[model samples]
Target: HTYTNPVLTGFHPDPSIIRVGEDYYMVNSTFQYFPAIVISHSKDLVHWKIIGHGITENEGLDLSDINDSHGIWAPDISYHNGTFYIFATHRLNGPTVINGRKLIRRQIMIKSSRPEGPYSKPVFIDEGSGIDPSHFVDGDGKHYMLLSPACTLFPLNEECTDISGEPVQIWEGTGRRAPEGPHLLKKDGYYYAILAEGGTGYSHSITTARSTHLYGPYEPCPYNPILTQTDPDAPIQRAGHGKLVETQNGEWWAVYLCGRPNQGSYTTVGRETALDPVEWTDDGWFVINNLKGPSLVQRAPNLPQVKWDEKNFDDFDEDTLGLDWQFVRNPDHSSWSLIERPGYLRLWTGDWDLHDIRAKNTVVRREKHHLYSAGVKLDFSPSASGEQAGIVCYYSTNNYLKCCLIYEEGLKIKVVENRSGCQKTLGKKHAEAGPLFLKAVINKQKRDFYYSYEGKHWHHAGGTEDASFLSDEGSRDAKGHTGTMVGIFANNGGSGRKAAADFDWFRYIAY
Candidate 1:
């Protein structure tokens, strides 16, 4: 069960996991996307497969003008007393309280009986005036909530509607920094509280404190920041926002959030997930012994599980869309063609880009793979002349890169980048013959791209364009808060373009 580091990585923020039978289930915050929450199942905490989405459909939530990194803050997932719950704050702005320019909401939960859930509707647990809500059912058989109000500690009132009282001077580590993402663990008789400190910047780190009582009078783990890469000179920097869990075999492990720089300390892929070994000292204090750089890849616990394989789009394989497939702007599954199209994914070509803060579009992104190839076979020809179809490296309408085609001109590839302030023909062939196959391959680690007309035949389009360069850290904007997601897009833009692309298939393979 020793997964040295990063059992899962790449923008997997605020992860919550629960062990059910021989399986382990986990999920993370999916901001403004249609499926508000993604539920992943694993046998050994390493191998993960998306089994269900928390939001069956986005009927109650409004995703109209929202963009990446905008909807939900840090969500905590836990299973308590036979009921599974996902509690998190949904703030349209920054951290709920401290940066209170906008209104804040309470912690919401979806209760379910099964691990792979058809969870109950969201319920208001605690109308806290803060963000990041975590729960712990203690050894005394009592439940308690640990949270940060305005980056400070505070107990919850009896009704749990708001802060119990004024801020408590607890778990203050090293600076007057914003400390958030709190989780509680009770083992034996000691209650452990872990906090993600140092802001979401490169200084990010993990610190721990313990108390005999749930509410401290707490003591810091003498070796403060039990987990961190924030040393003066460490390769893996900014490691924080973590949660602790014990394996079925009694092995202690912790999964925290961290971000890797694509160019330097500048990140566009947002924050990622990292794992480290946790061992309690003889005196009952816990510490992260691995002390260091993130291991690029690691093996999951050895439990009965599925093998790790590339996401391949072979028409015959039909169970669920590969983990890489997603619909933009929080898609409505019923508005999509699932089983209806026996072998093809029929996207009606929504008229907007999910990243477009102006109007919502139906789009999907690929799982961020460092070295992999992704391309799709689309029959974008439709009755109306307004349909535009093609594969794109999408971020938002005002700022993104795309290589797509219009119904009228056939398979003409065009590039649109907001920074460049214009769209240009990178390459195009007036296909009077009708639908054509187009594809793009991403070499993310190297920031290179290669495209092909057919899967077998490829071309060398050596372009060193960093995808992370188009984010909030790189280029600040309303829709540039998160990392980049490369995937198939069949949108009509937002100009009332009326067209449809019946994608024959989409293929993503790790080369």
Candidate 2:
């Protein structure tokens, strides 16, 4: 079986994998996006189905105080003794000096019996000064946690709730600048320590070391950086943060994060998940199959070829929301409903604007392809002056395009652009609206906005906006590690009265 490079595409970065029986499960970092962790299940490691999220509630974990990219960094998933454990780092705004030293973020853990689960409340491991935390259980049933402030190792007790003692410095890496994403594996009488180094840009790479004991005297691999895309001309850039998995038939594979460079290093899709075959040498050393660089296509594993449909349409007929939808922050669950009006998603707008990141009643899914179209039917007959509702192509609070119907003078549609802090009206047109459809189309050149009274005919509302500005490199204050999101939103800018909007359906298609 042959498949493409990105086994799991579109903004799935910092991937961690683990195999349980004949099934393989993977999880990735969601950062400040609500539904904190995105979990997926796969049999062939090529086609994946999103199972569900990990942190469903805001209690015991709060992302309100953190920045976009500063909430969740890297998460590791592993199974042992019928219990699935997820160890993740809760990163807060840092570099704030206290007592002449910087404060550290929190490392937390959650457990469940099933992959898609009502996970238990998060247990704090430590106010640790580290980023990517990975857990490893030895063959003797002993547990250990590997963390990053230069790759330290700590022993865990029977329950694995907390660390047993202070972390000992195991492998500091091969003199790389920012060494992180450490995973430990015990195989062939050797404890192999794997890590990602050289920051997370074009210079990103995977490095390894091995030792007989848990704590080293570890020997660094002679050929370090086993996988990378340092060349400027390479199609796939920023290749690193890899996790290894072994199949049921003794085949080995590695899953890592990389970006498909678009418009000269400005990745509109952000960092994505990539797959590579692995082979072990005669001397107990492991390396990527394509020793030179990443490959566009590779042979799929021998597991059952599973067919999973990527969600493209939602009619709001189901009792519960699908796995693809996600809120910007911890959503006020009482403010939205699907069953309140059958076949429609009802959103009650509170006193919050989409411009403010503090509170937003917006639900979005990844813009999964380079070229795609997303449209929604919104019935927002705003009763008062400051109410608005519509569809948005969002990157962040400061970077998005909103085609909203508001009650400024009368019922009308307006295109709002907020790039960085500069807010302006791109275009506006009066509408005699009962139910209006709003759409956004993104292609190679620009992002086009449209509105229609009837779903069949759409009129262009705004001038084409630069599509590159929503990407990682071009947008102002776009340092956050996330991709473009296209979805629906409603807000009542400063109105004290309750504003409500009904959405008939959301339809999306990738080209």
lDDT of 2 by residue, 321-438 (tens): 8898888877777889898898998988867777786765688988777788998988778877878888888777777778888888888788888776678888989878699988
Candidate 2 local Cα displacement, residue 492, angstroms: 1.4
Can you list the residue pairs that collide in candidate 1?
A: 34-330, 157-164, 328-363, 352-361, 353-361, 387-499
The Cα error of candidate 1 at residue 154, in Å, is: 7.4
In candidate 1, position 468 carries an lDDT of 50
Q: Residue-wise lDDT of candidate 1 within 1-511, one digit each (tens)?
A: 3454455655566777767666677777777665666777776666666677676553356665564566765777787667777767765554344344335455666667886567666665445556788766656555556667422454544323345456554555555377777777778888777887777677777777788976667777777777777464544557778788787777776777766565565454556566665777888887765554344444444455565654456552475665545545555454356465667666666665533554334555534455566577766664445456666665445445565565444444444444423343344444433545665655553443344555566554433355555444654555444555566666665445445456667666667
Which predicted model would earn the best TM-score?
2
Candidate 2 root-mean-square deviation in Å: 2.1
Which TM-score value belongs to model 2?
0.96
Q: What is the RMSD of candidate 1?
A: 4.0
Segments of candidate 2 deviating more than 4 angstroms? 58-60, 95-102
Q: In model 2, what is the error at residue 366, expressed in angstroms? A: 0.7
Q: Please name the candidate that would achieve the greatest lDDT relative to the true structure.
A: 2
lDDT of each: 0.60, 0.82
